[PDB]
Amino acid sequence: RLTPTMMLYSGRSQDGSHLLKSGRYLQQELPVRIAHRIKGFRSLPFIIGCNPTILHVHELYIRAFQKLTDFPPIKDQADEAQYCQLVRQLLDDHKDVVTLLAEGLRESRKHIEDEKLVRYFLDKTLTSRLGIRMLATHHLALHEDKPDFVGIICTRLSPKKIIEKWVDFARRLCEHKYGNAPRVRINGHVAARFPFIPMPLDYILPELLKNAMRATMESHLDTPYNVPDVVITIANNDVDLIIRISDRGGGIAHKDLDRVMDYGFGLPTSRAYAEYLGGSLQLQSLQGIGTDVYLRLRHID
Amino acid sequence: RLTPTMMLYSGRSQDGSHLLKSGRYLQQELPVRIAHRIKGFRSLPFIIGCNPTILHVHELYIRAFQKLTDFPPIKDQADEAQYCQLVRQLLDDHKDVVTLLAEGLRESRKHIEDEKLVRYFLDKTLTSRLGIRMLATHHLALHEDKPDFVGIICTRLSPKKIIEKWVDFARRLCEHKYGNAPRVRINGHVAARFPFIPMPLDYILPELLKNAMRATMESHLDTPYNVPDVVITIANNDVDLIIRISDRGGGIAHKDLDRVMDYGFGLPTSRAYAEYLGGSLQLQSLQGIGTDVYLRLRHID
Numbered sequence A, B: 001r002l003t004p005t006m007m008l009y010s011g012r013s014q015d016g017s018h019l020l021k022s023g024r025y026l027q028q029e030l031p032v033r034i035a036h037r038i039k040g041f042r043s044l045p046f047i048i049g050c051n052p053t054i055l056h057v058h059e060l061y062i063r064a065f066q067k068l069t070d071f072p073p074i075k076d077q078a079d080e081a082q083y084c085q086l087v088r089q090l091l092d093d094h095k096d097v098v099t100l101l102a103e104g105l106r107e108s109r110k111h112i113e114d115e116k117l118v119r120y121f122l123d124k125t126l127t128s129r130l131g132i133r134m135l136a137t138h139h140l141a142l143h144e145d146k147p148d149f150v151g152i153i154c155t156r157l158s159p160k161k162i163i164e165k166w167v168d169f170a171r172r173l174c175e176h177k178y179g180n181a182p183r184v185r186i187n188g189h190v191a192a193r194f195p196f197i198p199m200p201l202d203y204i205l206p207e208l209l210k211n212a213m214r215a216t217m218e219s220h221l222d223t224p225y226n227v228p229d230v231v232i233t234i235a236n237n238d239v240d241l242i243i244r245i246s247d248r249g250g251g252i253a254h255k256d257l258d259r260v261m262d263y264g265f266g267l268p269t270s271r272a273y274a275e276y277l278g279g280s281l282q283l284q285s286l287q288g289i290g291t292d293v294y295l296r297l298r299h300i301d
């Protein structure tokens, strides 16, 4: 049910009176959360906030906020229904945002004086963005009749099965560039099943696997046909879920340790999403051997 | 040669004129470093600093400082020689100190109001103590004719060989209580050899192995004859040395995470020695599976 500063509705109605309360809530919350993001764009240093791409994303939000406010209060099913259509448009229009931001800010490196100030902007924007798209997709999900799912929430989610999905996805991206990809072994609580929201995992994991596999391959150019396995370990307790990802790609060099976590661009975002959801994302480099990555995600309650 | 706030002499003389400079330095430095420790005892909260055991250790230092100052300047070989005899007495008299402290402070738990204040006292005392005993033993070591050793410094130290020593030591302590002990496998840079000082390792390692083995055994009471291996990984680069110690003893429970690193009593001391020498000691608990421990030690220069 609950989430940081927001609620994901666990409710059921044969007549769909839950979709009213859900949408009624969404229409109260969404505009507020968007507005907070607009203050954040306004607070940007002039020099940066002026860069056209940043300025475009800035506009997108103003547009979204207009559209949401303009939409009239929901008093019946048909309202809610057409509301869903908006949320769909919005989700599609903002789908490339994180990319735009990245380039908006890449163009804008030189004029960057205070780093902490932007890293904060990004964290607050990218994560606050997540929460929005989660809350939105949860709602749309309430219309689906999918089994084992209350909204976007799995009732019986297997960490193993979902890691495997992202593995095949990552193996493929990888094989294509290097001709091979490291075998991936998974141990620990591989039979674990429990209520959870795939969405966060759906961003983060392919990030970590892409790295694990990239580093592994990049360090064995001589023997791409025989590379050390990527070892994933799952630990499920009553507090949170840990997923450790071990690679043997010589680890992140000492100098790069600072630079790697700061905003190639995928780890800092993953750390942010993790912290946002009451979890974390820690690194252990073993220079000369490999890297171990620890992702913790709080259990839902 | 160098060390934090102190120098370990790399020098050679057929006539032993190095033992003069060495001792001349020791006799300048030792009294200063002891005096700093006495200010630390004086700064203790009255209530604690009054506890007889703390008071005894307090006295020991005053005694040591007397003895060192009283000893007359070294102008010849025979001076230095009898100086060595003092340092030997001192090293023996202060050998049980860390234990005394621990009990001095255990008796004194109730009257503890500011924790950070004592944890700091301990870190500064135990580590500053290390440096003293290192500097002292280095000197005495300069008299030995041992090959591959300049003082207490190994010229060709194998992390593997030294871990193995502490493993056999830990296996034994362990087998005695549980009847078995986990096999220990070592990977990574197992052929690494390089200049180093065994001493720090000689404290720390048996600590970590004792834990790795304790946890492993304590979690497999049903099958002590078949327990998951302890996996040690060595990573040697040009900056520092990493030793990772992985166990499968279900890890440190969430609640205990805070308590475990604070002053059973062996980890906090190990973290302190590590930091002191420009290294660190990090933990990764995987609740339900095990713990991974990362020890970094700067390379000598």
Ligand SMILES: O=C(O)CCCc1ccccc1
Residues within 6 Å of the ligand: A030, A034, A064, A087, A090, A091, A094, A095, A097, A129, A132, A133, A136
């Ligand atoms: O996703 C973003 O970039 C910002 C959110 C846009 C949006 C709002 C409400 C519902 C759906 C989407």
Ligand SMILES: O=C(O)CCCc1ccccc1
Residues within 6 Å of the ligand: B030, B034, B064, B087, B090, B091, B094, B095, B097, B129, B132, B133, B136
């Ligand atoms: O070891 C301690 O507890 C404090 C050091 C005592 C000592 C001083 C000089 C040389 C040898 C020993």
